[PDB]
Amino acid sequence: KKTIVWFRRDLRIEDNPALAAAAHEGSVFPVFIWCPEEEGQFYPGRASRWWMKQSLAHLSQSLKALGSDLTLIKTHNTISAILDCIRVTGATKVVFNHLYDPVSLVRDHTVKEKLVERGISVQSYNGDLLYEPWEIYCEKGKPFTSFNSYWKKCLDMSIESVMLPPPWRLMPITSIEELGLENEAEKPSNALLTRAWSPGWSNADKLLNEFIEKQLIDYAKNSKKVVGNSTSLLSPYLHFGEISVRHVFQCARMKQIIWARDKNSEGEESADLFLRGIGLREYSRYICFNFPSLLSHLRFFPWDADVDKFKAWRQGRTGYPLVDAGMRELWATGWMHNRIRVIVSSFAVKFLLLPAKWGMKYFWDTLLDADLECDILGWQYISGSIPDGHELDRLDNPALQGAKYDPEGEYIRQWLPELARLPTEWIHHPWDAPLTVLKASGVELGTNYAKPIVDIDTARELLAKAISRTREAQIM
Amino acid sequence: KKTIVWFRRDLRIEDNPALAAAAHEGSVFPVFIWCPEEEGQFYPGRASRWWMKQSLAHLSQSLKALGSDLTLIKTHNTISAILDCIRVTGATKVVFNHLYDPVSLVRDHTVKEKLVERGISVQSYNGDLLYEPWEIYCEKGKPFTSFNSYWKKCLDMSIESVMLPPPWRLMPITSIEELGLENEAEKPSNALLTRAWSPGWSNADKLLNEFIEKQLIDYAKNSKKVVGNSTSLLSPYLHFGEISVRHVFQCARMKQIIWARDKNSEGEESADLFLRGIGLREYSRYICFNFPSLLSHLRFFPWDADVDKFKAWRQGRTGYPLVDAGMRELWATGWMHNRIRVIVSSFAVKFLLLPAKWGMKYFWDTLLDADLECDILGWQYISGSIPDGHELDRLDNPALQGAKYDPEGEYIRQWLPELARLPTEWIHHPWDAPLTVLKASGVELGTNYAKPIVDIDTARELLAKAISRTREAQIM
Amino acid sequence: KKTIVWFRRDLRIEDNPALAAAAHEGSVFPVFIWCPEEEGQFYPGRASRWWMKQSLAHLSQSLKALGSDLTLIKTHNTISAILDCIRVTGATKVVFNHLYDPVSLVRDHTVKEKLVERGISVQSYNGDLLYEPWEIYCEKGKPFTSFNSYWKKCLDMSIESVMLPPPWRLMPITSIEELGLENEAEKPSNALLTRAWSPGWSNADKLLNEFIEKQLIDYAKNSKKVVGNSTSLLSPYLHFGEISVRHVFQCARMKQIIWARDKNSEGEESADLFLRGIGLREYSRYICFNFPSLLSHLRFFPWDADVDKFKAWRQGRTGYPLVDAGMRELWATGWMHNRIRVIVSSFAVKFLLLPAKWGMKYFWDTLLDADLECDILGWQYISGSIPDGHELDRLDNPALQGAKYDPEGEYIRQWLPELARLPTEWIHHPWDAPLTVLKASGVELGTNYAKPIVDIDTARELLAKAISRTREAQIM
Amino acid sequence: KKTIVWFRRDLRIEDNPALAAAAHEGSVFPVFIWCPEEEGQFYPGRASRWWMKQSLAHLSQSLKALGSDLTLIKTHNTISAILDCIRVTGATKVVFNHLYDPVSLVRDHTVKEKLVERGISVQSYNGDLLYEPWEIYCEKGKPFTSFNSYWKKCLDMSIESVMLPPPWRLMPITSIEELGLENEAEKPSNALLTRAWSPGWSNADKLLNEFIEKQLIDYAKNSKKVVGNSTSLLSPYLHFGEISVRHVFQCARMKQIIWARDKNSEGEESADLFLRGIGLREYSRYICFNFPSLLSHLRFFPWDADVDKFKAWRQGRTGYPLVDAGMRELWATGWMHNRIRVIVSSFAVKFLLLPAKWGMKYFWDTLLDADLECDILGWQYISGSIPDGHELDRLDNPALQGAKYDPEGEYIRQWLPELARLPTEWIHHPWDAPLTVLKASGVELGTNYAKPIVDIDTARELLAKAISRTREAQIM
Ligand SMILES: Cc1cc2nc3c(=O)[nH]c(=O)nc-3n(C[C@H](O)[C@H](O)[C@H](O)COP(=O)(O)OP(=O)(O)OC[C@H]3O[C@@H](n4cnc5c(N)ncnc54)[C@H](O)[C@@H]3O)c2cc1C
Ligand SMILES: Cc1cc2nc3c(=O)[nH]c(=O)nc-3n(C[C@H](O)[C@H](O)[C@H](O)COP(=O)(O)OP(=O)(O)OC[C@H]3O[C@@H](n4cnc5c(N)ncnc54)[C@H](O)[C@@H]3O)c2cc1C
């Protein structure tokens, strides 16, 4: 009769099963409810609130071209807000799509019991995953604990889900500003993020075509290089649900059969490794559902509570050029390559030895794709929580990690133009360069480029004493 | 019979009248002589010696494909060096091309009398100019003193010179390394200039085609913008004589008649303004020939002899973002847009009030197109020596000169990535921004960006007291 | 356990429901059986047998890259041939896809009862249609009789079918040449069809991308012009089942939502008219299933049994330049634009008044997309059998049908280069041109271009006497 | 003071020495005089008069954009016409450019003596040649008699001429229609030549750029193939003087030094063979100047005066497909490839044995580049007049000349679409094909393709009897 489609993090119209199912019977009107106080400490950060504002306006005009209007409501309790929207419009059903983070699971469990008190039929759908996490089990019917044990089952699952076409027409018979999504001082500096990004589902479709046709071919040899645009740059579109992940899986498995029929064995190997990256997004929702504070294996660790070392880390003034170039790209554009996120966060935890909660809260505020389940899997991968993760006893050599991800030094020279005439054999560790090499370029360490804020042999021996105390503070 | 073609600053084979005339009679062999001690204080700088080294090797292989070999000689006196090359090879003639800087004029005057002592016929040719400076006169037969009085005569001169084809074959019947053109410490930092530049006459021809076909059309509206490659980037090719200037004048006047026949009035107006820039190169040789220390109208000026202000100027750490971005581009690439060269040199002379000799010697060492006659006309244009030049009583507003040459702030954000989230209305003067605007971006002045090293009202009143003393020290 | 996939007219691997269902359980091996004697008079023609030969070899190597081999069998009775293939390989199931022409419907009905005598499970699938013809009914549950009554129901059908991905791997545990598909005299003239066409499912995918990205935009204004490639040229791929028709419907309805979101109202109108052409392919299978000699409303028509008029028609020597250019393109390439097929077949039936069986048998032998159900709907559309078809009392003016489909005369000048200097106002009717116009070009009618073989006023009055006799021979 | 620039066959403004010299002193006005009755039998043909009409209108508007107007005069005596134009405008000088055909040499000799009777200074210039024909001599100072003896001297001539820039402005202080250049019946068939050609000097410049950048590279391997556009298509621009031939020589010798510096030895060899074709245009003016009826070595030849064989030759209905395709391209477009002009004219002279005057008059009427001196050299090359020409005792095999210039048969299939399904081993000689091959395509010889009008063994023995009679009729 009358159905509310409640948009939360599915801001698209293609392959939207809650919008497609409501457009079969009767009258539809779409609703977004901004209720950030139920998230608690996972209130959306500053750069994420800019992206929601831009793509809700993109979604509102596209629903108007199908013939409707998007209704906005601001409350401190969203379960009292859709119920007040039902009493106004006289609606009988509420349809929405699932979410899997642990805050929204107990929130969606309560809104179902809140609305059979008023006799409203509530239907929820799957719009985010390939399979649901209660479908992938082991031989005994128990959940997995490693990724490649989990991903070899999803590729042999005896089924696969489909892509729904969008509806042909919507019908209403007809709101708050909610534009509180930004402060007025931070407003012109937020608008400079549009030099690199453009939100909306119509732009997510153009970036999937641009990746499939240009650099998906070279992905198996280039996905670790930070020079050049070698990855898809799809992660803020995939976080807000502007591109369907089953739409990506279908199109990549169709390019793979054409390249196997040309015997292009490298382009075919690239299509296999790109789908493994999509399976890491599937796995982050999997262990969040099954094993829902966070990093408890580091709770007797002696952390250095130094706030000016934290200020030098986010300013990009540490004296380590891969860390400084990554922190300047993060502030300028709101995105980092995956291998640079490992570099700047291993530096914060192992070298400066600041608390990991401090760095997680800075990533939550400055990344455009700040995802609750993917930030958990990333910070557990660098701290050694995951079984098949990184080791904690190890510190990375700056010259070796420089040669892997930035072999010609062109990532450092783009973001630190003061080091543009420094040769590549010393550009990732300028404190080791001899004195006449440094002044053959225009570099004096301490005046126009910084000295290293901690020496590498200082923190390597400061960690082994700090590792060996939390081993005996845990046994007591 | 046997003819030496002495290459000095004409490193090409197309439109080379000394090479073309020698290839008519008999045996030819080419000679370069590196003799930098006759230049005195105009010894070629560090970046210029890198370009000569790369393009002599480019010229040597192209003369081999015509069938010869380039002979190199190093001496502290070049007039004793070609005479020793004549006695070895048994040559009868020496042909070369003219130069017009005041050191080479008295040096070429002496080598003619040095070689009729041995009975050697010496012929010199015009390879650098459209007309010779003893051909453009006024109505009474006297030289001009302004540029547009001079350039309206050259466009109505009753003649024009032609483009010689290269010879079809050369004939010898057959050297020092001279590779002393770089220090071994400065060698790997010099090689990083190849990220932006490629010397040689074959590359000068590809950059003339690339400019004529892409952005010569938009030159009349874009030649003052430093964002984007809006100019030709031909000046280090035109300084070393790898592209002929009569070849440029012919090809641009042929595009102008095609655009006038399509009634493309803006593309035709752009071709008129680009040839006016070539006439400024002609005019710099004109007043050097007629009026050959240099800036004597500022000789009782009180200069501040502060050497750490000079170190902060060439490091790009002054706190003025147009000056800092221009000084970082100059060190990284060896080239600046013409409007930025006015900005960074007016700042050194009017704000810091350092001696102009100090800044001229730094431009001589860091520019790839460091030309003796063009650096004279440029530094006389900013100091008020020229009649139709800049005023000396004026200081430029940083916001207004920012909006003219960098209207969207994309030149500052490329070279100073720390200011990438600062809005455009304050990016050229961050000390005027309110305090919540600066911390809405990641900018604290004094820690990750510098404070202005002198305030603008300090130096404006320091100049008016310094101007008014050299007015009375000159009358005494 | 072991399953035969019987390929008949579904020569692809993407969206193949019989191949996809067999690849779930066990061992698969593919089989084609050439049995042309069960078709009777619908034995495949000469150009169709060339295309089957080229695309079976294309399908055989693509099944090898998935790990199998295609087995070929030649029999005069295909129901005795798959049963002999089961006894060899020890297979338990046979899966295939439906067909809807009236010969294959009674043949598939008998092979099901032939194989439960041996206890073999037989499954058939839908691979050719959007919906099955027993699903589209009227309000009373009866089949339609007009096209636009039928197509307005298919666009409102409460369901739609999906696109299956191809299998990841096939398994056999392992044949006749059947290459009898061409005679040895006709073999080198058949191979010249490759100048215009390339069979195989991998080429059907490249022609769908090429049409969606280039000229689908302009289809609503260009689909009646025979100058230029304005249509998709997909019909021999769609006849042999090398491209899926649900794959076309999905991709065209996705381009339609992007163009509606740019307010490109003409590109959106073109996507609506292209899907109406696909619905004509759906409708031809619909009335073949419900109303399964053929043109019985012309059975007392007095036909002229003149065999040299039939020889002049297929040679393209009639003196009517649209008919002659269409007959020369048909012999050279094996394809005609849809508006030219109306022209050359209305000419054979209304002007020459030859029997329509004679022209249908020539189209069956010379077209690459000679489809049984689509040739029926086409020849019923020109003869007036269909209710919403052409009128039979009318003859078309050659100048008016020339201006509609060939407005600048460039289709005639391509295929009849003798008329290249004839102006456009007379190029479609040269017998009406004045005598000095014809000899201002190089045209003398009767020597280098033919006179019209029948005059237009002769056959217009010969038809009205021939129409009015079959009206009274039918009432008796 | 006042100067007439008399345009005859130099319809351009770039590199025009008579227009450039007049634009130095005073007032200029341009004049074309149409006087076709002084040419006698070399009255310009039908297709040439269409091109003059189109490019005089192109030249008139381009002189208006320089500020003048083109004056037209029609007379039966041009020497009385410019003298009447002098008396009207009060002009003092007449400047024009040389021509070298033997009619214009004695006409220009008389107009000089006609105008010193009135005291008018007459100056003539070189605008058509690289060198003048009184500058290329042998060792004794005598003219050459072979081409490669002549062209090895022009490449070693101790000089070369230059390219003048166009004037910047013209000055008048200010006519008949002459549009009689076409009949009103032939007017709409002449306008269809614009499908392939576009006259004017601005289009001659775009076709020189298009050839230098696309297919000059492949010229040494493709200049004998008639499939594809492998030559420059510059000959009607070079005949009417819309492109300068010194402009072509300069630009091709500049591409040759760039390709020699990349060691592109095939692109460099192509630039050498293209300039040899330009030297054939130079040589045709050379022997016309020195050895000024025409083919007197065939004057006792027994010619067959059959006028219906002449009608079948120009209709393209001989039964020889290379001759028929060349005659249909010539009538449609007005141009033929150089190897096809040898084929269709050797066929007219050796097979049909029609008088060569009959075929020369048909080429004069149907070619757009019908040049008096180049048609002489071409018809002397096929008849054996030239020493290094063709032999007269030989007749060419149609299969061998077919494989040289049309190896895949795609030139025949374009112009004779009736033979599109005939395989390549018989497409150049269909009378030798076996009977089942011809009817496997749609070819019956005598009905839809013609039988050969003379058999090849008939005319081979008819020529040897006709050769051997003019040997004894000449000795008497
Ligand atoms: C410390 C740390 C924190 C991270 N925080 C986040 C976060 O907040 N949000 C987030 O989306 N990703 C996070 N990641 C994962 C990774 O950095 C990004 O997903 C990656 O940069 C996406 O960029 P892309 O689209 O170009 O990658 P692509 O190579 O194009 O990857 C394709 C898609 O797969 C997914 N994906 C790829 N790699 C991973 C991965 N390792 N884990 C999960 N999903 C993946 C993303 O949706 C991505 O768009 C984090 C990683 C680390 C080490
Ligand atoms: C006398 C006559 C005989 C015909 N015989 C045949 C035949 O044997 N086989 C055949 O496939 N078509 C036949 N047609 C239909 C039509 O001529 C062709 O389908 C059309 O030329 C396909 O070319 P295309 O792919 O470029 O067209 P498009 O415009 O690209 O059409 C898209 C697709 O829709 C289908 N289609 C389009 N128009 C029609 C139509 N009128 N009827 C049925 N399907 C259509 C085809 O599969 C075609 O590939 C006949 C028409 C006439 C008038």
Q: Given B185, B315, B317, which is nearest A437 (Cβ)?
A: B185
Q: Check A440 against B328: CB less than 8 A apart.
A: no
CA distance A191 to A182: 11
The residues, any chain, with a CB within 8 Å of residue C139's CB and separated by 6 or more, are none
The residues, any chain, with a CB within 8 Å of residue D133's CB and separated by 6 or more, are D100, D143, D285, D286, D289, D290
The residues, any chain, with a CB within 8 Å of residue A460's CB and separated by 6 or more, are A395
DSSP-derived 3-state class of residue A265: helix
- Exposure string of C34-43, with b = 16+ CB inside 10 Å and e = fewer, is bbeeeeeebe
**Does residue A450 contact residue A444 with C-beta atoms inside 8 Å?**
no
Q: How far is CA C249 from CA A235, A245, C200, C256, in A?
A: 29, 21, 20, 11
CA distance B96 to B99: 10
Chains with ≥3 CB–CB distances under 8 Å to C: A, D
CA distance C188 to C184: 8
Instruction: Indicate the domain borders of chain C.
Output: 1-129+169-197, 130-168+198-291, 292-476
Q: Does B309 contact A at CB distance below 8 Å?
A: no
Q: How far apart, in Å, do the first and last CA atoms of chain B sit?
A: 64
Give C142: exposed, middle or buried? Use CB within 10 Å, 0-12, 13-18, 19+: exposed
Q: Which structure tokens are listed for A339?
A: 């291998």
In the block, which residue shows the tokens 């007749």?
D395
CA distance B149 to B287: 13
Q: Which structure tokens are listed for B323?
A: 């000056």
Q: Check A261 against C62: CB less than 8 A apart.
A: yes
Four-residue CA torsion sign, A210, A211, A216, A220: positive
Q: Which structure tokens are listed for C155?
A: 């666009």
What A229-234 contacts at long range (C-beta under 8 Å, 24+ apart), as own/partner pairs, is A231/A337, A231/A338, A232/A207, A232/A208, A232/A274, A233/A207, A233/A335, A234/A204, A234/A207, A234/A208
Distance from CA of C62 to the nearest CA of A (A): 7
The phi-psi region of residue D160 (left if phi > 0; otherwise alpha if psi is between -120 and 50; otherwise beta) is: beta
Distance from CA of C37 to the nearest CA of D (A): 23
Q: Which structure tokens are listed for B216?
A: 């010569």
The phi-psi region of residue A17 (left if phi > 0; otherwise alpha if psi is between -120 and 50; otherwise beta) is: alpha
Helices (H), A66-139: 79-89, 102-115
Read off the amino acid at residue D261: R
Atom 44 of ligand 2, residue of closest alpha carbon? C281
The residues, any chain, with a CB within 8 Å of residue B214's CB and separated by 6 or more, are none
DSSP-derived 3-state class of residue D200: coil
Q: How far is CA C412 from CA B324, B406, C324, in A?
A: 69, 59, 9
**Does residue C329 contact residue C410 with C-beta atoms inside 8 Å?**
no
Read off the amino acid at residue C112: K
Resolution of the entry in angstroms:
2.6
Report, in angstroms and rounded to the nearest whole number, the Rg of chain C calculated over CA atoms.
24
Q: What is the DSSP letter of D201?
A: H
Read off the amino acid at residue D300: F
Method of determination is cryo-EM
In the block, which residue shows the tokens 């005339």?
B21
CA distance B169 to B166: 9
Mutate to test the pocket of ligand 1, among A197, A374, A388 (most ligand atoms within 8 A of CB): A374
Closest C-alpha to B296, from B474, B419, B144 = B474
Residue A233 Cβ < 6 Å to ligand 1: yes
Q: Which structure tokens are listed for B461?
A: 């009143």
Q: How far is CA B59 from CA B7, B10, B62, in A?
A: 10, 10, 5
- What are residue D335's DSSP bridge partners? none
DSSP-derived 3-state class of residue A6: strand
Read off the amino acid at residue B285: R
Q: Which structure tokens are listed for A55?
A: 């793509």
Please write down the HEC assignment for all residues of B230-244. Answer: CCCCCHHHHHCCCCC
In the block, which residue shows the tokens 């581009």?
B329
Orientation angle between helical segments C79-89 and C102-115, nearest 10 degrees: 40
Q: What is the DSSP letter of B3?
A: E
Q: Check D261 against B163: CB less than 8 A apart.
A: no
Give how far the C-alpha of residue B358 lies from the chain's centroid of Cα atoms, to the nearest Å.
18
Closest C-alpha to A190, from A337, A365, A8, A11 = A365
DSSP-derived 3-state class of residue D74: strand
Closest C-alpha to D33, from D92, D111, D105 = D111
- Residue of chain A nearest B190, judged by CA positions: A421
Read off the amino acid at residue C319: G
CA distance D42 to D55: 20
Distance from CA of B408 to the nearest CA of A (A): 11
CA distance B417 to B227: 15
Q: How far is CA B370 from CA B183, B402, C451, D431, in A?
A: 19, 26, 81, 78
Q: How far apart, in Å, do the first and last CA atoms of chain D sit?
A: 64
The residues, any chain, with a CB within 8 Å of residue B282's CB and separated by 6 or more, are B129, B130, B131, B151, B154
Orientation angle between helical segments D398-405 and D338-346, nearest 10 degrees: 170
Give B343: exposed, middle or buried? Use CB within 10 Å, 0-12, 13-18, 19+: buried
The residue count of chain D comes to 476
B23 among annotated binding-site residues: no
**Does residue C350 contact residue C390 with C-beta atoms inside 8 Å?**
no
The residues, any chain, with a CB within 8 Å of residue D394's CB and separated by 6 or more, are none
What does the CA dihedral C303, C309, C311, C313 come to, rounded to 10 degrees?
A: -90
CA distance A354 to A342: 16
Report, in angstroms and rounded to the nearest whole number, the Rg of chain D calculated over CA atoms.
24
Number of H helices, E strands in chain B: 20, 5
CA distance A29 to A5: 6
CA distance D374 to D388: 16
Chain breaks in chain C (C to N over 2.5 A) after: 174, 292
Give how far the C-alpha of residue A457 lies from the chain's centroid of Cα atoms, to the nearest Å.
33
Give how far the C-alpha of residue A228 lies from the chain's centroid of Cα atoms, to the nearest Å.
20
Please give the number of the atom of ligand 2 that sits closest to the Cα of C223.
29
Distance from CA of B190 to the nearest CA of D (A): 26
Closest C-alpha to A24, from A3, A9, A6 = A3
CA distance A451 to A432: 11
Closest C-alpha to C228, from C368, C405, C367 = C405
In the block, which residue shows the tokens 């380590």?
A320
Closest C-alpha to B241, from B427, B339, B100, B115 = B100
Chains D and A touch, using 3 or more CB pairs below 8 Å: no
- Exposure string of A43-54, with b = 16+ CB inside 10 Å and e = fewer, is ebbbbbbbbbbb
**Does residue D122 contact residue D3 with C-beta atoms inside 8 Å?**
no
Closest C-alpha to C331, from D443, D322, D447 = D443
Q: Check C254 against A165: CB less than 8 A apart.
A: yes
In the block, which residue shows the tokens 């306008």?
D191
Residue B471 burial (CB count, 10 A): 9
DSSP D314-376: HHT-SS-HHHHHHHHHHHHHS---HHHHHHHHHIIIIIS---HHHHHHHHHHH-TT--HHHHH
D18 among annotated binding-site residues: no
CA distance A406 to A321: 11
SS3 content of chain A, % helix, strand, coil (to 5): 50, 5, 45
Closest C-alpha to B273, from B310, B317, B218 = B218
CA distance B228 to B216: 13
Q: How far is CA B75 from CA B111, B178, B180, in A?
A: 15, 10, 12
Closest C-alpha to D29, from D2, D8, D56, D11 = D2
Q: What residues of B are in contact with residue A335 (Cβ under 8 Å)?
A: none
Report, in angstroms and rounded to the nearest whole number, the Rg of chain A calculated over CA atoms.
24
Give B37: exposed, middle or buried? Use CB within 10 Å, 0-12, 13-18, 19+: exposed
For the CA of A378, the nearest ligand: 1
DSSP-derived 3-state class of residue A232: coil
CA angle A119, A124, A125 (to 5 degrees): 155
DSSP D20-71: HHHTTTSEEEEEEEE-TTSSGGG---HHHHHHHHHHHHHHHHHHHHTT---E
CA distance A233 to A336: 10
Residue C225 Cβ < 6 Å to ligand 2: no
The residues, any chain, with a CB within 8 Å of residue A129's CB and separated by 6 or more, are A100, A245, A282, A285
The residue count of chain A comes to 476
- Exposure string of D90-111, with b = 16+ CB inside 10 Å and e = fewer, is ebbbbbbbbbbbbebeebbeeb
CA distance B220 to B201: 27
Give A141: exposed, middle or buried? Use CB within 10 Å, 0-12, 13-18, 19+: exposed
Count the alpha carbons within 13 Å of A460 in the hemisphere toward its beta carbon. Answer: 7
DSSP-derived 3-state class of residue D133: coil
Q: How far is CA B259 from CA A240, A421, B216, B268, in A?
A: 51, 43, 12, 6
Q: Which structure tokens are listed for B84?
A: 């020793």
Q: Does B205 contact D at CB distance below 8 Å?
A: yes
The residues, any chain, with a CB within 8 Å of residue A178's CB and separated by 6 or more, are A32, A34, A72, A73, A74
Closest C-alpha to B91, from B12, B174, B175, B10 = B174
For residue B255, which phi and psi values (nearest 5 degrees)? -70, -25
Closest C-alpha to D254, from D241, D235, D267 = D267
CA distance D396 to D182: 39
- What are residue D125's DSSP bridge partners? D97
Q: Given D331, D413, D423, which is nearest C188 (Cβ)?
A: D423
Q: Given A158, A166, A257, which is nearest C257 (Cβ)?
A: A166
Closest C-alpha to D398, from D456, D333, D442 = D456
Q: How far is CA A158 from CA A285, B286, C21, D61, D432, in A?
A: 21, 85, 11, 76, 65
Q: What is the DSSP letter of A127?
A: -
Read off the amino acid at residue D397: N
Chain breaks in chain B (C to N over 2.5 A) after: 174, 292
Number of H helices, E strands in chain A: 20, 5
- What are residue A5's DSSP bridge partners? A30, A95
Q: How far is CA D245 from CA B167, C72, D126, D241, D398, in A?
A: 20, 67, 11, 8, 36
The residues, any chain, with a CB within 8 Å of residue B449's CB and separated by 6 or more, are B319, B416, B418, B419, B430, B443
Q: Which structure tokens are listed for C372?
A: 């049984």
Q: What residues of D are in contact with residue C313 (Cβ under 8 Å)?
A: none
The residue count of chain C comes to 476
Please write down the HEC assignment for all residues of chain C. Answer: CEEEEEECCCCCCCCCHHHHHHCCCCEEEEEEEECCCCCHHHCCCHHHHHHHHHHHHHHHHHHHHCCCCCEEEECCCCHHHHHHHHHHHCCCEEEEECCCCHHHHHHHHHHHHHHCCCCCEEEEECCCCCCCCCCCCCCCCCCCCCHHHHHHHHCCCCCCCCCCCCCCCCCCCCCCCCCCCCCCCCHHHHHHHHHCCCCCHHHHHHHHHHHHHHCCCCHHHHCCCCCCCCCCCCHHHHHCCCCCHHHHHHHHHHHHHHHHCCCCHHHHHHHHHHHHHHHHHHHHHHHHHHCCCCCCCCCCCCCCCCHHHHHHHHHCCCCCHHHHHHHHHHHHHCCCCHHHHHHHHHHHHHHCCCCHHHHHHHHHHHCCCCCHHHHHHHHHHHHCCCCCCCCCCCCCCHHHHHHHHCCCCHHHHHHCHHHCCCCCCCCCCHHHCCHHHHHHCCCCECCCECCCCCCHHHHHHHHHHHHHHHHHHHHC
The residues, any chain, with a CB within 8 Å of residue D67's CB and separated by 6 or more, are D169, D170, D171, D172
DSSP B141-171: S---SSHHHHHHHHTT-S-----PPPPS---
**Does residue B436 contact residue A347 with C-beta atoms inside 8 Å?**
no
The residues, any chain, with a CB within 8 Å of residue A263's CB and separated by 6 or more, are none
The residue count of chain B comes to 476
